Design a protein around this ligand. Structure first.
Ligand SMILES: CC(=O)N[C@H]1[C@H]([C@H](O)[C@H](O)CO)O[C@@](O[C@H](CO)[C@@H](O)[C@@H]2O[C@@](O[C@@H]3[C@@H](O)[C@H](O)O[C@H](CO)[C@@H]3O)(C(=O)O)C[C@H](O)[C@H]2NC(C)=O)(C(=O)O)C[C@@H]1O
Ligand SMILES: CC(=O)N[C@H]1[C@H]([C@H](O)[C@H](O)CO)O[C@@](O[C@H](CO)[C@@H](O)[C@@H]2O[C@@](O[C@@H]3[C@@H](O)[C@H](O)O[C@H](CO)[C@@H]3O)(C(=O)O)C[C@H](O)[C@H]2NC(C)=O)(C(=O)O)C[C@@H]1O
Lengths: 295, 290, 292
């Protein structure tokens, strides 16, 4: 059984085994190396791999990671301090607001909607009711801070400097007088001074022309009666007038009343009592009063 | 003599002078060499001269050769949560009310005093003031009732005279004016019969007043007390058919009793006479109110 | 024959002794049956699978990008949602009258306690307040009305009327009701007998004493104060005699002046006669009264 060449021991090998000069070696890629005389795994640097516990193992932070079914797994305890902080905000916070409350979602700012006329914010940031002036109508008015009665309604004085005219059955004449005027509540008082006139008739008219002669702030319209231009027998009274023709006057008791106001002219009736022939009349001071027009 | 190799220990084996090596999965032939086999891409790689693990350097780092999370992984999440915690609303104090389950903030208000207008604003509820006559609503404000300031009426009734056994009656038509707290009865001129030195004139307001004025509306604020109010002088023409002699008498309001107003007429002397001519006279006095 | 002879030496990790070859192995390499194997003690994420050495990871938490271990972005989805949810609408700051305490996370509101309060029901409410009123406007049985005292007050004067004229001086004790109604005062003198009078003269009412409480002297001052006026001018008939039948003269009376609590009335006109005694009619004196 003679083959020319007799192989003895080992004459060949398969990769990664190789033979050079009758010496056998093993080729090694990166990752495999020699540690002393033994084949070793090479783990350059520090990347989480290490030779420990008898072999190749992967290392990880035992607070952040764990192994479940031989799978790298996040420990749930690494998220917990996040979930409890959020959960602590979810348990109670404001997401929406109802009027008068207003939340601007984009600025995260909360404010309150109020009404200027009724409410105001003071110098302390407090919400407060605005101190409002109540709606009043003369003669009701603001009096030193409160709801009162206007002093101008209670009393007002002025003067009329003007013409008194007598008319009656052809008898004719006029005189100039200065008179105080007092307006008190809903009345006007015209305080005529004593004056001298001429012939009067049994019945006649004494007219006061308020179209001119009223001193500011009074105007003609302020002498209009509350009964306006109706014909009345208002404030009828008895006046004594001295009649004469140069000599000793005879005092006649006459009847006088406010009868009508028309277009600024107050007309007073003067009648009754006796009559005599005479050329002169000595009139007494006479106050004439009546209720005054208002608006 | 033999110097060769005749047997080998695993993982080496020999058949017919040829040696081979047995390899499990994970070890493999790469070109001529033994190599670690790493199928797919699972983070493992042969690099920098050996076996290494590969990790996103934004999320992980290595500390004492352990895989570790970068702290900067959570920086965004911790900053955001901190951005809320540092200042937010978790609770509300009345009248502010927070429902924790719906995250709704609303305000508790009193429906009688406050309200929310169409503008969605908080505004004080308008309240009409409580007013007592003669204070009243005048064209929308607190004013003085026009009716208290001036009221016109009329009396058509009997005036009667009584003095020292002289008696007689007359009918008159008189305007009445009520102005603030006074009443004025404007009697017209009238004729009568004989009068005494002193006597009483009576106005019977029980009948004759124009609706809606009533008898009680003529009651003095001094009610039925006896007074000497509004004393004045009046001239009365006394005659017996001829030319009258005018006597100056003294007249005042003396008492109202049950709708009848009494005026005293006395003084000024006396003559013998059968007829009297009375002037127009206005009678005024403070009027009753409740 | 000519023999091949073969291998006679070897390099680590192979070694030869007495015709036997062995291979030295360090930790991490081990025998698995007759094969060479990677040793992986325990479970640390490493495994032999799919043909070789692989690393294993939770596929919900990690992924492989560029062959680098990486965090799935879906790991942070539950958290990014909740945070965002709060972010899109929450209260960070409050404006007066609202006040947020950034530390206690407590929101309240600042109110003025003089005009506003919190009731029993926890509601916000305006405090009920009485309107501010000025006499003669007053609280009348619950509402805003006209004070009854201003509408009618009654009192009395018990004192001396004095006449003065052309060297004539005399005085007379009288009593009179006083009525104050709205802005007027009325003094109701009774008829009385006096003595000689002149053509013109002054009748004076001394209000310094004799007014009944709660009326005071000052209460009789006219709204025109101490101005000299011709107010309430009227006719009065006065009987003049020397003990016999009086002759009645028509005189002119009016309010002339009030001064230091004494009211003066002018009385003039209508002629005259020699006489020693005067019979005065009842006279009511009225004028607008002073107010504060
Ligand atoms: C993390 C990683 O890269 N994994 C690789 C893996 C790894 O490199 C080795 O296991 C380490 O030793 O190799 C895997 O197979 C690859 C092929 O994709 C190797 O064979 C590798 O790449 C080459 O593969 C050739 C290709 O040239 C040719 O196109 O296709 C044939 C098959 O048809 C071969 O696969 C390559 O891409 O060129 C040749 C190269 O020399 C090889 N490297 C080594 C070190 O031998 C694997 O193990 O499955 C693929 C895996 O993704
Ligand atoms: C990630 C992992 O699985 N690690 C394993 C590890 C790993 O598979 C190898 O290192 C990779 O080559 O192997 C570890 O040891 C085990 C046994 O503890 C291996 O020997 C492995 O186990 C098997 O179980 C055998 C039984 O078949 C036998 O009857 O009894 C023995 C002693 O109890 C074992 O139980 C198995 O899983 O089937 C046999 C199997 O063939 C073995 N695998 C290989 C590749 O030879 C280790 O290294 O310690 C365990 C470690 O968890």
């Amino acid at each position: 059984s003679g083959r020319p060449v007799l192989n003895q021991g080992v004459t060949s090998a398969g990769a990664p085994l190789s033979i050079r000069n009758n010496r056998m070696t093993m080729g090694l890629n990166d990752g495999l190396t020699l540690s002393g005389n033994n084949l070793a795994i090479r783990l350059p640097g520090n990347t989480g791999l290490n030779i420990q516990n008898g072999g190749l193992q992967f290392r990880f932070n035992t607070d952040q990671f764990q192994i479940v079914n031989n799978n790298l797994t996040l420990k749930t305890t690494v998220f917990d301090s996040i979930n409890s902080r959020i959960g602590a905000i979810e348990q109670s916070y404001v997401a929406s607001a109802v009027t008068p409350l207003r939340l601007n979602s984009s600025t995260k700012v909360l404010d309150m909607l109020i009404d200027s006329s009724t409410l105001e914010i003071n110098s302390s940031g407090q919400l407060t009711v605005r101190s409002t002036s109540p709606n009043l109508r003369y003669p009701i008015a603001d009096v030193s801070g409160g709801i009162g009665m206007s002093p101008n309604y209670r009393f007002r004085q002025s003067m009329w400097i003007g013409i008194v005219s007598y008319s009656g059955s052809g008898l004719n004449w006029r005189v100039q007088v200065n008179s105080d005027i007092f307006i008190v509540d809903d009345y006007i008082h015209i305080c005529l001074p004593a004056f001298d006139g001429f012939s009067i008739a049994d019945g006649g008219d004494l007219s006061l022309n308020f179209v001119t002669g009223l001193l500011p702030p009074l105007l003609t319209g302020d002498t209009e009666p509350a009964f306006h231009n109706d014909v009345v027998t208002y404030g009828a009274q008895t006046v004594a007038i001295g009649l004469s023709s140069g000599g000793t006057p005879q005092y006649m008791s006459k009847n006088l009343w406010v009868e009508q106001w028309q277009d600024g002219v107050l007309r007073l009736r003067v009648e009754g009592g006796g009559s005599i022939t005479h050329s002169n009349s000595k009139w007494p001071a006479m106050t004439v009063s009546y209720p005054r027009s208002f608006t």
